[PDB]
Short mmCIF file of C-alpha atoms in Angstrom, two decimals:
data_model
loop_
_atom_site.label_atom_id
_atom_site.label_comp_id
_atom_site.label_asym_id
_atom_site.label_seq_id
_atom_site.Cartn_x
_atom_site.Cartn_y
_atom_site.Cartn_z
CA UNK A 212 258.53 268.95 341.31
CA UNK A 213 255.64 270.62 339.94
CA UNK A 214 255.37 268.86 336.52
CA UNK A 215 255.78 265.18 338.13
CA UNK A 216 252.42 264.47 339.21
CA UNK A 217 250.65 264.15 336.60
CA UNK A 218 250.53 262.77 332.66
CA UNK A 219 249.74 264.93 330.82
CA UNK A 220 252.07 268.15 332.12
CA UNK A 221 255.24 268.88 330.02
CA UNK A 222 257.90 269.85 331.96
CA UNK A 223 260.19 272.88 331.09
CA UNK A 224 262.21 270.25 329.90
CA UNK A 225 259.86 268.36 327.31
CA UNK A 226 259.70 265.35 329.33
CA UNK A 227 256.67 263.63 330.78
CA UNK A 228 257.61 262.72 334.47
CA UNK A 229 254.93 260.02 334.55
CA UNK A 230 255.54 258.19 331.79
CA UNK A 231 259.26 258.13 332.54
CA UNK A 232 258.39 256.49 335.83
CA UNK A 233 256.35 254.02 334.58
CA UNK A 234 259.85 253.28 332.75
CA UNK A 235 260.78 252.96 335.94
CA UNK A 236 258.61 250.41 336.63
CA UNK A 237 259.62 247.77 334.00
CA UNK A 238 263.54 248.42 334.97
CA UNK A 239 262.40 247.41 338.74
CA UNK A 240 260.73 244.30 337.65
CA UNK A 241 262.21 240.98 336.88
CA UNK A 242 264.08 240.41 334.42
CA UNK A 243 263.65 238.97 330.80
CA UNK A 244 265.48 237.91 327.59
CA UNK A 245 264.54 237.69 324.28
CA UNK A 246 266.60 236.93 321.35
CA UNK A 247 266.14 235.52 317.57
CA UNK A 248 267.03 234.23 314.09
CA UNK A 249 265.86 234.69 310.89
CA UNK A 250 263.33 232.21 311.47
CA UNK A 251 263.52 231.78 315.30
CA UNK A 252 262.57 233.74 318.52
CA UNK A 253 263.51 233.05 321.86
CA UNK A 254 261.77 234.27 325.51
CA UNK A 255 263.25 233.78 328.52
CA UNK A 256 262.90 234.70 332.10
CA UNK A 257 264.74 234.35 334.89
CA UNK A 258 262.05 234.29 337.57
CA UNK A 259 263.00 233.83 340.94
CA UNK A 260 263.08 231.35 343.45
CA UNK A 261 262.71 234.25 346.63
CA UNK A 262 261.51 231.84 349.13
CA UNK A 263 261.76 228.22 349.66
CA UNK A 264 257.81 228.63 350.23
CA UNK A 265 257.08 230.41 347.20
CA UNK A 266 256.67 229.95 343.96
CA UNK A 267 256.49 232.37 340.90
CA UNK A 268 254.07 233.54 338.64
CA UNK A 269 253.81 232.69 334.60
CA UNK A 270 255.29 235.79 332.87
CA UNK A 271 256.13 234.37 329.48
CA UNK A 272 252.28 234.38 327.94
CA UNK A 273 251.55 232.38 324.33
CA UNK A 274 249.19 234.49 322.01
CA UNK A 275 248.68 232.62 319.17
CA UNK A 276 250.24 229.62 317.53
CA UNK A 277 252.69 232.04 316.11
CA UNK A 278 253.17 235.12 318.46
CA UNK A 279 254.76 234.84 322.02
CA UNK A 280 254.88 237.76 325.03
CA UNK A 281 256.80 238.08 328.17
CA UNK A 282 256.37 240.83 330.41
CA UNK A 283 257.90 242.67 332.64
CA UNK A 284 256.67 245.19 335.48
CA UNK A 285 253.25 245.37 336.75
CA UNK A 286 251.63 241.75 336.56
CA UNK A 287 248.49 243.00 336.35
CA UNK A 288 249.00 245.09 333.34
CA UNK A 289 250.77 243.05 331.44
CA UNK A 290 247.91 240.04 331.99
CA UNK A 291 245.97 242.94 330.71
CA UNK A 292 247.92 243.43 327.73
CA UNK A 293 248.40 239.67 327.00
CA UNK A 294 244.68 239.48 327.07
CA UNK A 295 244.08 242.08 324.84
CA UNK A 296 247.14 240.50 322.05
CA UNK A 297 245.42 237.31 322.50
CA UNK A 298 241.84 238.84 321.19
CA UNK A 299 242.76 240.64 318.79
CA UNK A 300 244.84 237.72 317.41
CA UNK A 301 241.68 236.15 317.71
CA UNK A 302 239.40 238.64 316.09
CA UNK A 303 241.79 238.64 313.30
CA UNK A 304 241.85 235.13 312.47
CA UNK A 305 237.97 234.91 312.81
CA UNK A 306 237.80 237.47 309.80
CA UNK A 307 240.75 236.54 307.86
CA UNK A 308 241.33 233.13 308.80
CA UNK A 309 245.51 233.74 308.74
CA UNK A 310 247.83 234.63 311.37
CA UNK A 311 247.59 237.70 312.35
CA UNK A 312 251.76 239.45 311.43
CA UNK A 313 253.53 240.74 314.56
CA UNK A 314 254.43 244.27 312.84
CA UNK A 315 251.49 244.85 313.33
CA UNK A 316 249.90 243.70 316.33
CA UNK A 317 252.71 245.30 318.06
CA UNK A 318 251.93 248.32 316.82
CA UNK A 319 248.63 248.64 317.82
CA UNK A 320 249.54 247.65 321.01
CA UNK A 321 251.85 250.48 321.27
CA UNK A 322 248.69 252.43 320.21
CA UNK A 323 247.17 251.64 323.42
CA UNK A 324 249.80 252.38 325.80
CA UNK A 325 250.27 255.85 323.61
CA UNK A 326 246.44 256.20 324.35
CA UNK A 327 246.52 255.54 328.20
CA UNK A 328 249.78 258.37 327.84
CA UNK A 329 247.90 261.07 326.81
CA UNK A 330 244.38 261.66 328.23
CA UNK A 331 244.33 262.80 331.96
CA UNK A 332 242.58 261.05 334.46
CA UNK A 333 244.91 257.77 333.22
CA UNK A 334 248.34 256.43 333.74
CA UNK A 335 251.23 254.30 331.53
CA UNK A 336 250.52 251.15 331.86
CA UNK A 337 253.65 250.27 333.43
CA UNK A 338 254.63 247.08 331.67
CA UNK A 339 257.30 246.59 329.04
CA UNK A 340 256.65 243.83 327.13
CA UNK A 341 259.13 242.06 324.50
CA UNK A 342 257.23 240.30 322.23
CA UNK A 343 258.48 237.83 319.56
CA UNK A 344 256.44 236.23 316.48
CA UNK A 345 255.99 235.15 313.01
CA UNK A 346 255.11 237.50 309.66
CA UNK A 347 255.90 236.29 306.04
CA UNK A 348 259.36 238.39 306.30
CA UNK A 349 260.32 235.40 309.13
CA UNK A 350 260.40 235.98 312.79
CA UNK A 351 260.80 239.20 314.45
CA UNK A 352 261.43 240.69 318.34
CA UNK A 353 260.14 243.36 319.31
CA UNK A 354 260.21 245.40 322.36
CA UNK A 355 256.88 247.49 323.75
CA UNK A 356 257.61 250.26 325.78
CA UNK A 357 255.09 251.91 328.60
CA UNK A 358 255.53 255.14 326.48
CA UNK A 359 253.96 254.02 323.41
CA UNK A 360 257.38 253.64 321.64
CA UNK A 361 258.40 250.21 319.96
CA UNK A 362 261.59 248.55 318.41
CA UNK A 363 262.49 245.61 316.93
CA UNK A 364 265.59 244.11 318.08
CA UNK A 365 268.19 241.22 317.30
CA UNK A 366 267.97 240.23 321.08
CA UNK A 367 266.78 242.44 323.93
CA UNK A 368 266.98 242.21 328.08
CA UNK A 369 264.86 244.02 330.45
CA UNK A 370 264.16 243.94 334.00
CA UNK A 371 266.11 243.91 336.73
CA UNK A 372 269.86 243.53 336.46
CA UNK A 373 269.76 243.51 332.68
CA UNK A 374 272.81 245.20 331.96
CA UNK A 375 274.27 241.64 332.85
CA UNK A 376 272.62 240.35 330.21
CA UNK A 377 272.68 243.13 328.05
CA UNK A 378 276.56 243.21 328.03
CA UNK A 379 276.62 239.80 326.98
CA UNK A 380 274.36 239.48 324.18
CA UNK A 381 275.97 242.88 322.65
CA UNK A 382 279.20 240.35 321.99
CA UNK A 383 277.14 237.68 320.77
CA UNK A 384 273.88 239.10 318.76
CA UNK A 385 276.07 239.33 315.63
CA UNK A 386 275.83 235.33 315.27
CA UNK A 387 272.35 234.58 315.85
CA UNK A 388 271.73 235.94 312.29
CA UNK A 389 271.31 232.54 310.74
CA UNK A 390 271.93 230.34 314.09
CA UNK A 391 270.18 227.56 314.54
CA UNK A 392 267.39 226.94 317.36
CA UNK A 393 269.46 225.24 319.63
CA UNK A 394 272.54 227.77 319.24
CA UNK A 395 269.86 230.62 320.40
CA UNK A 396 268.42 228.31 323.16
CA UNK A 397 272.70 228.07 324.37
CA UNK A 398 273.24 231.66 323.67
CA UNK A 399 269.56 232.48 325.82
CA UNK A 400 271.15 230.20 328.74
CA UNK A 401 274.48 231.99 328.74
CA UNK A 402 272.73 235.22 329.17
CA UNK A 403 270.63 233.91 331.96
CA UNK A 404 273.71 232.85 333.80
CA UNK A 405 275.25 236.14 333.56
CA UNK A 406 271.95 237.83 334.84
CA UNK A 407 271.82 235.61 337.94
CA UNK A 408 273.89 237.05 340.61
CA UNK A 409 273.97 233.85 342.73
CA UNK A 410 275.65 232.19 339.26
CA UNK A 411 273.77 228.99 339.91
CA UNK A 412 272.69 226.91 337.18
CA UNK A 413 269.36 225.29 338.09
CA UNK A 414 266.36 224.75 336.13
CA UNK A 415 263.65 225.99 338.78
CA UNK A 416 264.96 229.70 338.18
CA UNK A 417 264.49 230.35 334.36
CA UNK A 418 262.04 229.50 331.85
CA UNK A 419 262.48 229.66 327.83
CA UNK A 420 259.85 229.36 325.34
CA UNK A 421 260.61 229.26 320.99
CA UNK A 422 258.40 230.15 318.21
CA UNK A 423 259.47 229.39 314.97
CA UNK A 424 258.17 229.63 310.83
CA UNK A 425 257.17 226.15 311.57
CA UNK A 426 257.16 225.71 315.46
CA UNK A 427 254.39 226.71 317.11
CA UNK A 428 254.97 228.79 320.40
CA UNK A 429 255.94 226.27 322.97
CA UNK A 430 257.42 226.75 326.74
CA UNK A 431 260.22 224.39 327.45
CA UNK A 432 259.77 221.68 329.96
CA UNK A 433 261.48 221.93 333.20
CA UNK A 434 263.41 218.34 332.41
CA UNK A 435 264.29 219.59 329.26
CA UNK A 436 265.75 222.95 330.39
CA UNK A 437 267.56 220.83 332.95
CA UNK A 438 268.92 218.72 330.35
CA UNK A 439 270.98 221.38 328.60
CA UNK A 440 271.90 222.83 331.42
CA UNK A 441 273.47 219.50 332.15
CA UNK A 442 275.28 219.56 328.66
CA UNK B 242 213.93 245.38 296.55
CA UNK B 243 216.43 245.41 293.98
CA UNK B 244 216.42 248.09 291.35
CA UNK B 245 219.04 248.12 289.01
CA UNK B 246 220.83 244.41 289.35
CA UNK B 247 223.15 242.73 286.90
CA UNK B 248 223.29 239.33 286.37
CA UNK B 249 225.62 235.48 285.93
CA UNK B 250 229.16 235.87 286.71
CA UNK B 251 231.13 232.54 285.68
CA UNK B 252 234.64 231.32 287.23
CA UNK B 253 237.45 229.30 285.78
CA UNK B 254 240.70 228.51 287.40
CA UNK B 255 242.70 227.89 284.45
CA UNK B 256 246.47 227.06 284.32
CA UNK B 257 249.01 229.40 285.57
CA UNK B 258 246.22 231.92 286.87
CA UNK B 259 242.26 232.73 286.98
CA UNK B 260 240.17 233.94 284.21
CA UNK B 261 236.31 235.38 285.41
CA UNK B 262 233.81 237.08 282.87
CA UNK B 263 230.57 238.81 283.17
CA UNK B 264 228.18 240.71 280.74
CA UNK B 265 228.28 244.46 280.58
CA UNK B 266 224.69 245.14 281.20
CA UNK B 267 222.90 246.64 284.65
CA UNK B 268 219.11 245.86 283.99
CA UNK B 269 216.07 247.20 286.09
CA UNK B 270 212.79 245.22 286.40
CA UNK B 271 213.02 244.07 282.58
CA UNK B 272 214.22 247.29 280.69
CA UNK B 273 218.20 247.49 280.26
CA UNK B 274 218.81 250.76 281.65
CA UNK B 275 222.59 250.50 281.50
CA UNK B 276 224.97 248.23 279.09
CA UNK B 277 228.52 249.89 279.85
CA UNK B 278 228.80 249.06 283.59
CA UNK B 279 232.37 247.25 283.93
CA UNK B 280 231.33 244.90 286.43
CA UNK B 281 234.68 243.67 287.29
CA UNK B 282 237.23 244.83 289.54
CA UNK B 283 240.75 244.09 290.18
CA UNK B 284 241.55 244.36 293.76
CA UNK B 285 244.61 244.59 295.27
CA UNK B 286 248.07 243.24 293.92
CA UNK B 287 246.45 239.14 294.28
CA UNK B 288 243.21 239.48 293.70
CA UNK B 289 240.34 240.03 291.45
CA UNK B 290 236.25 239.69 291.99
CA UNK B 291 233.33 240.58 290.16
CA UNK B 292 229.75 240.59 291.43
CA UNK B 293 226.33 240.34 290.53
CA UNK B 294 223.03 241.63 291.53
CA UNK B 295 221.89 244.82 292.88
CA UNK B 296 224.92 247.62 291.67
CA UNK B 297 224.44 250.20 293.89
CA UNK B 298 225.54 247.50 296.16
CA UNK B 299 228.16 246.20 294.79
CA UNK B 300 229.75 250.01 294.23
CA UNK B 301 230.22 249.99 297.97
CA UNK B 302 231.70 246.98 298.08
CA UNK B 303 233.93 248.62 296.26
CA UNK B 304 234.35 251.42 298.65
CA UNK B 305 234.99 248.91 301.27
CA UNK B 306 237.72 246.89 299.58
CA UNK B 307 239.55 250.38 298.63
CA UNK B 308 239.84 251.07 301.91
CA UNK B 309 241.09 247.73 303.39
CA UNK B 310 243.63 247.32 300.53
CA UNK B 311 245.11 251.10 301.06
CA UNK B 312 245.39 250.46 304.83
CA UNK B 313 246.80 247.32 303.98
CA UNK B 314 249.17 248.60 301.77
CA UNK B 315 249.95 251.71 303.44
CA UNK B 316 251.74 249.63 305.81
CA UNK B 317 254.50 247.87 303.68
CA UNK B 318 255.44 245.14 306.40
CA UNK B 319 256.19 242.79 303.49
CA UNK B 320 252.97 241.00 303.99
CA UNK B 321 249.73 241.51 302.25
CA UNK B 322 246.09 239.89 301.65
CA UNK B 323 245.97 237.34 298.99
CA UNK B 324 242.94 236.62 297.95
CA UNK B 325 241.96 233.63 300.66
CA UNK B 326 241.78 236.68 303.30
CA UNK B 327 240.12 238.99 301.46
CA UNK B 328 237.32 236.17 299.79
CA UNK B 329 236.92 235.71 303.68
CA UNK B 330 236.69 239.22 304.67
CA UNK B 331 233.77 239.52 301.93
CA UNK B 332 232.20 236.25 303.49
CA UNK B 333 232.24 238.20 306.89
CA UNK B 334 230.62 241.36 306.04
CA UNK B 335 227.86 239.86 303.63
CA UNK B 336 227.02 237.24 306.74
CA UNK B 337 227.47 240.39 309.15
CA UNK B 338 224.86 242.19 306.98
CA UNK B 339 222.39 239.71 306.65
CA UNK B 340 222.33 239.52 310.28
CA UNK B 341 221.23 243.18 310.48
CA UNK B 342 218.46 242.23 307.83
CA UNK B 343 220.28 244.61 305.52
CA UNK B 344 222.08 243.09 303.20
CA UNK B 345 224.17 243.28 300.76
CA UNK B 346 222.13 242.07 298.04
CA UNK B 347 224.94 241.20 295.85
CA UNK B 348 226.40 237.80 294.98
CA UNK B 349 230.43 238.25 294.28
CA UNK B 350 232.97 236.07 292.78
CA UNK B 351 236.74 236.63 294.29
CA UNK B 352 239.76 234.42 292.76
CA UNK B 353 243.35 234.99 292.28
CA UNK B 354 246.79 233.59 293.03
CA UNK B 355 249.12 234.51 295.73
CA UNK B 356 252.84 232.21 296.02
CA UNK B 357 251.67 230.14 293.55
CA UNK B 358 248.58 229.21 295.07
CA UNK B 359 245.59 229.82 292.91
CA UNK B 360 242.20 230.96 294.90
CA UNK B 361 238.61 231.00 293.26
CA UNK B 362 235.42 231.29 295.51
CA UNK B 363 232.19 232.72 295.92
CA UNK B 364 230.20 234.41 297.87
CA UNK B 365 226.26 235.20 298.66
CA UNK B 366 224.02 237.64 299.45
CA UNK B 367 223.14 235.91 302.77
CA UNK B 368 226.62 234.70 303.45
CA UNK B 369 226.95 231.34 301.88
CA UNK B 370 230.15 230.83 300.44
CA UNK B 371 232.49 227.82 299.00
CA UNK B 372 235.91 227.94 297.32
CA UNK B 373 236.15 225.45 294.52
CA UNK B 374 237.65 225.12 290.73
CA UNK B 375 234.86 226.65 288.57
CA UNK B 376 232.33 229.17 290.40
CA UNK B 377 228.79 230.84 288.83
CA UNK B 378 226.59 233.18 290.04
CA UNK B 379 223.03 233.87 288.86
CA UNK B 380 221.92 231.50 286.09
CA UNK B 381 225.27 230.91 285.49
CA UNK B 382 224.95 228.47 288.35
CA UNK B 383 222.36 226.52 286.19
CA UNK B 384 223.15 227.32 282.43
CA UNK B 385 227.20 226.99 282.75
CA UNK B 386 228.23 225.11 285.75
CA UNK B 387 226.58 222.26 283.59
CA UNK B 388 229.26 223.28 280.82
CA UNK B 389 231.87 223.55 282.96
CA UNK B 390 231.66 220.72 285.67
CA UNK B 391 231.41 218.77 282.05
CA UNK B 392 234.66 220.24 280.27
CA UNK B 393 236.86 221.35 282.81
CA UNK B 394 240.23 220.45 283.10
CA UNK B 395 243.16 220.37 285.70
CA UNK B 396 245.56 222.60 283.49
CA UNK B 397 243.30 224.14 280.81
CA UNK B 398 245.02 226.18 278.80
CA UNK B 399 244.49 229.99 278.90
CA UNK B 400 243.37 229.74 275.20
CA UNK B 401 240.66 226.85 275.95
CA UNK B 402 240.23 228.68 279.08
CA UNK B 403 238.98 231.46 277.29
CA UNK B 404 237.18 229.38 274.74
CA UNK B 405 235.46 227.18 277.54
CA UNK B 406 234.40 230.47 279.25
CA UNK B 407 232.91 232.24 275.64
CA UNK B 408 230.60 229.23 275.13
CA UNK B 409 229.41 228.99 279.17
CA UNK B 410 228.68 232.97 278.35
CA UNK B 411 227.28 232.48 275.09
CA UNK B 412 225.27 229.74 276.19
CA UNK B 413 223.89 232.03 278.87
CA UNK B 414 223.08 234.86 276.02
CA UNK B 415 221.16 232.59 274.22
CA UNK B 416 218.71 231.75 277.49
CA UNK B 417 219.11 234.21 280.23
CA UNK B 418 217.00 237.23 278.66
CA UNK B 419 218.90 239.59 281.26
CA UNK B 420 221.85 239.35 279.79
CA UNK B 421 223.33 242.09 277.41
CA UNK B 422 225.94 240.92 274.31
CA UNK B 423 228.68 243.48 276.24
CA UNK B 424 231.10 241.17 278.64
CA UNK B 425 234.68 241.47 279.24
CA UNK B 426 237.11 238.14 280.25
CA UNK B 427 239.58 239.32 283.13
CA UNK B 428 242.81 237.33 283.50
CA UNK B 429 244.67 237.21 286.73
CA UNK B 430 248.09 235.84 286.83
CA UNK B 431 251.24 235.52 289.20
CA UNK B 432 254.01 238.40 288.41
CA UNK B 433 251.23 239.40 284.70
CA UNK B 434 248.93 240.82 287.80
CA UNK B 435 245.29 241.55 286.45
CA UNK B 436 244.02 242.63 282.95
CA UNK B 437 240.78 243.04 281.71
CA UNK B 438 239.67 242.31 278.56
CA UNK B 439 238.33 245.18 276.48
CA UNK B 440 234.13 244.85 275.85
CA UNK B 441 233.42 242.72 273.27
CA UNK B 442 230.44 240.49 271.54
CA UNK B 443 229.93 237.57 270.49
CA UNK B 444 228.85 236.18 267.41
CA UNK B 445 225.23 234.09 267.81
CA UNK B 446 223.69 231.63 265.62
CA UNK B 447 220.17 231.73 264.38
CA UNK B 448 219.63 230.28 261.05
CA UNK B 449 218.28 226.55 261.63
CA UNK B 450 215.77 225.90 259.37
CA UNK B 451 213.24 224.55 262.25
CA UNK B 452 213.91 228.47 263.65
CA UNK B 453 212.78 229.90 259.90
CA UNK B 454 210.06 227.70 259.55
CA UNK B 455 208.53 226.29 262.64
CA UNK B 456 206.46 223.32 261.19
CA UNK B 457 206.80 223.20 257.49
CA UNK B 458 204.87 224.76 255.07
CA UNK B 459 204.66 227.06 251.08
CA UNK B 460 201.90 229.01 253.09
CA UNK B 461 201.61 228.50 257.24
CA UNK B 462 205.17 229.21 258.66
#
């Protein structure tokens, strides 16, 4: 295929081969979960236990008291991308001394991946991010793309095997409207379980983090997590 | 050097909303070349600063703050600077400027009320800056700060506020010799937003009969 090697070719077709696949990257990767309230925002991530040797690697990143990231795809990138969130959060409280909204911080992160999409000589940074903070309109989700697109979303899954997930939380998003914490933490645990193909419930495998109007972003313990499991 | 500079403007955080006043007049060296230069500015929906010292300056200022408060509005997130970010955003780029040995050689007052919380600060040509009550620039930081430290209260009324503020700015005309009888009174409010008062001057007292006569006498004096 002549028009797949290379960015910044439009195929007869009006799609950009490249960035598509670095689409594909974020669909190979594992999976995450993200879902909210009007005031809450839960990230999840069902990171694997491959090996009894091995161990994984931190994918759900904090940002700032009030903003919270977890990738999905390239590690690299998205450390990249986490680092560059967590300086301009920075930069903007330094000058403004407030948080820093997510509508908007999300968008100019979409601004880079756009940027890396269209000059030659670069590539998508294959990493999907969902990222989930605080703005004076409450708590939001949103959902980065490698394409420089970006939604907001009631509750989102990506990764690997996320149509598991996915099908769940389409029969349950309607109800986290107003649900309290916990009731997202149950609902986030639910679609975790569906996700994992061995079906065991075990605290090792997933992690959850919650940032709230007044909770600052916060990962869950691994006795904690194991706790409600238990319930 | 500065060429054409204005001079005090005074700060009162009265109840319910903010109240700031400042002379009409744009002097250079001693002469008053200019005594119709609105030196107060409402800025965004929240806010609401006026500034003193060199005016070419303080016209850019302008230009800056236009620009962040149409980006920031052009956005409409739901979420906007009140006037704690923008005081601080002026606070950067004075600071920023006097590190290039270029400054901004203008000395601003910002105040207004966002949610019910009620901002007044100041800010300097170097970067010094404090957030309190009652803020002066100029000689209004010796000639009315005096006044107003003294007769400042927690819910002054926007009456006495404006009475308070006409004898600070009075005071000032009697002793500042930069200052022209031109000044305008701008009220900021929550859901009123910002109004300016229409120029205006104020009646002065002269006749004391130690002013007519200095010593006493049918001849000398």
């Amino acid at each position: 295929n002549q028009y797949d090697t290379d960015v910044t070719t439009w195929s007869p077709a009006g799609r950009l081969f490249q960035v598509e696949y670095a689409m594909e990257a974020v669909k190979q990767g594992s999976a995450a979960i993200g879902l909210r309230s009007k005031t809450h925002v839960v990230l999840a991530c069902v990171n694997k236990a491959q090996s009894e040797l091995s161990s994984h690697q931190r994918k759900i990143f904090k940002v700032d008291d009030h903003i919270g990231v977890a990738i999905a795809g390239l590690t690299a990138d998205g450390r990249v991308l986490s680092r560059y969130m967590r300086s301009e959060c920075i930069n903007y409280g330094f000058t403004y001394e407030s948080s820093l909204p997510v509508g908007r911080l999300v968008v100019q992160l979409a601004d880079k991946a756009q940027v890396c999409t269209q000059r030659s000589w670069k590539r998508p940074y294959g990493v999907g991010l969902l990222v989930g903070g605080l703005d004076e309109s409450g708590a939001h989700l949103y959902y980065n793309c490698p394409s420089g697109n970006y939604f907001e979303y009631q509750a989102f899954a990506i990764g690997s095997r996320s149509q598991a997930a996915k099908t769940y939380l389409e029969r349950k998003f309607d109800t986290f409207d107003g649900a309290t914490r916990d009731e997202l933490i149950k609902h986030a645990l639910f679609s975790i379980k569906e996700t994992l193909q061995g079906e065991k419930l075990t605290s090792s495998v997933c992690t959850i983090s919650v940032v709230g109007v007044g909770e600052p972003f916060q990962t869950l313990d691994q006795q904690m997590v194991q706790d409600l499991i238990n319930s | 050097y500065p060429y054409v500079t204005g001079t005090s403007v005074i700060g009162i955080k009265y109840k319910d909303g903010i109240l700031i006043a400042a002379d009409m007049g744009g002097s250079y060296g001693s002469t008053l070349r200019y005594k119709s230069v609105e030196r107060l500015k409402g800025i965004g929906k929240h806010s609401l600063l006026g500034a003193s010292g060199e005016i070419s300056d303080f016209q850019e200022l302008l230009r800056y703050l236009d620009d962040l408060i149409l980006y920031d509005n052009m956005w409409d997130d739901g979420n906007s600077f009140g006037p704690k970010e923008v005081h601080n955003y002026l606070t950067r780029v004075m600071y920023n400027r006097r590190n290039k040995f270029n400054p901004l050689w203008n000395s601003l007052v910002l105040g207004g009320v966002k949610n019910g919380q009620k901002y007044l600060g100041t800010v300097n040509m170097i970067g010094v800056h404090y957030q309190d009550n009652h803020v002066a620039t100029g000689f209004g930081n010796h000639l009315a700060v005096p006044i107003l430290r003294d007769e400042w209260k927690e819910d002054l009324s926007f009456e006495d506020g404006v009475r308070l503020l006409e004898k600070c700015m009075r005071v000032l005309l009697y002793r500042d010799r930069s200052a022209v009888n031109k000044l305008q009174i701008a009220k900021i409010t929550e859901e009123g937003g910002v109004t300016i008062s229409p120029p205006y001057s104020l009646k002065t007292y002269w006749e004391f009969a130690a002013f007519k006569n200095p010593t006493a006498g049918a001849e000398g004096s």
